[PDB]
Amino acid sequence: RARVVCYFSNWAVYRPGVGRYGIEDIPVDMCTHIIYSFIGVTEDTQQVLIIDPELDVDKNGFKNFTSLRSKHPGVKFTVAVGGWAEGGSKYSKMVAAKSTRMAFVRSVVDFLNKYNFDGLDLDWQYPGAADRGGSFSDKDKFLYLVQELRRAFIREGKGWELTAAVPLANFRLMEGYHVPELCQELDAIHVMSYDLRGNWAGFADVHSPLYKRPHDQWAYEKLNVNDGLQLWEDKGCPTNKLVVGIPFYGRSFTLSSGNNNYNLGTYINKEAGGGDPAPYTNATGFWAYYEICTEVDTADSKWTKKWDEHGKCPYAYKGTQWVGYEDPRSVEIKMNWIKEKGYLGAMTWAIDMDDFQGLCGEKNILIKLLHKHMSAYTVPPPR
Ligand SMILES: *[C@@H]1O[C@H](CO)[C@@H](O)[C@H](O)[C@H]1NC(C)=O
Ligand SMILES: *[C@@H]1O[C@H](CO)[C@@H](O)[C@H](O)[C@H]1NC(C)=O
């Protein structure tokens, strides 16, 4: 009764060579819930925005995805609205008034019906965030949107789920999330327990540390997976609504010129914007898991791999390049910790970045770990 929640990126199909990942590559049987990412909202009319219509509609992306239920009827297939690239201002604008919320809600209902989705995942990043076009009133009005969506889903009578991807930093919770009221309306809270460190922070560090490290101070003191999930509990979310995100990617850095200190917390060349882009994801500061293992794990690799003894995450470096990530050892540790805490399950961003080709060894090695641990686990009653 635990969840294994798999986000699927619709843009992964454009990655070159062995990076190409489409609907047919999803290992459906390893997941209990799979989420097509992303749709957005229109700026002007507050309706569902289809972001890649040639792929999503003309080549039948949405329906290929949802029709996977024919062979796997026990799996739920939903869609996510929002995500980083969509920005936050259109969402803050959409929730500002009852009328614009109801237009969005109606559009959502039409969309889910048309493409046979099982529900909606809310991925607005983030209500109340000033750097993302948000403002103070988002907190109340995001809750209203959620209540109104739930009521609309009830009226449709198809048992649709409504979930949300959420941050774990306290200031973001204070700015955007009425925790007890949201957790009551949502079927699951997908906690983004990753991107907790990165180039924007100005130092090198792993991005999903499980526990506090000695160098964690001020806004970072509690910014780790364990304390962050504890924060969601403390703010009123039941343990059996919390799903813990696991990143299948690493955050990378370019170290400062002449820096020979590779320890956690070491200074970086912030203006570089992150580590050099990798060949398949082509994004500064970001490496898919398979881009990491093909570089770090080869027999003749010149990369040095280390282990964060407190955060329980690997990191690796070579030259000016430094990457923190999750590997089978760190994922296993997190799976055991999820069961120890009694949380609802595990989530991954994102299934298209697992070693799905088996370039490094076992195909789909990371999602197999989530599936192995969660499928044998019984979620206990709320604590
Ligand atoms: C959907 O499936 C059809 C038939 O297999 C295929 O031709 C098409 O490329 C698929 N669309 C996408 C977006 O994967
Ligand atoms: C890689 O990303 C950059 C933007 O950073 C883009 O301009 C460039 O065309 C991309 N290269 C490939 C091979 O897609």
Numbering used by the authors: 24 to 406
Quote the study that presented this structure, word for word.
The glycosyl hydrolase family 18 (GH18) chitinases (EC 3.2.1.14) are enzymes that hydrolyze chitin, a β-1,4-linked N-­acetylglucosamine (GlcNAc) linear polymer, into chito­oligosaccharides. Among the eight groups of insect chitinases, group I chitinases have been enzymatically well characterized and have been shown to function in a chitin-degradation process that is closely associated with insect moulting. Our previous work reported on the group I insect chitinase OfChtI (previously called OfCht5) from Ostrinia furnacalis, a species of moth that is the most destructive insect affecting corn production. OfChtI is highly active in the hydrolysis of chitooligosaccharides, colloidal chitin and α-chitin, and exhibits kinetic properties that differ from those of bacterial and plant chitinases.
To investigate the substrate-binding mode, three proteins, OfChtI-CAD and its E148Q and E148A mutants (referred to in the following as E148Q and E148A, respectively), were crystallized by either co-crystallization or soaking with substrates. E148Q and E148A are variants with the catalytic residues mutated. The crystal structure of E148Q at a resolution of 2.0 Å was obtained after a six-month incubation of E148Q with chito­hexaose. Unfortunately, no substrate was found in the structure. This indicates that E148Q possesses partial hydrolytic activity. The substrate-binding energy changes for E148Q were measured by ITC analysis using (GlcNAc)3–6 as ligands. Based on the ITC analysis of OfChtI-CAD E148Q binding (GlcNAc)4–6, an increase in the polymerization degree of GlcNAc [from (GlcNAc)3 to (GlcNAc)6] results in an average free-energy gain of approximately −1.0 kcal mol−1 per GlcNAc residue. Additionally, the binding of (GlcNAc)6 to OfChtI releases 1.0 kcal mol−1 more free energy than the binding of (GlcNAc)5 to OfChtI, demonstrating that OfChtI possesses at least six substrate-binding subsites, as deduced from the crystal structures.
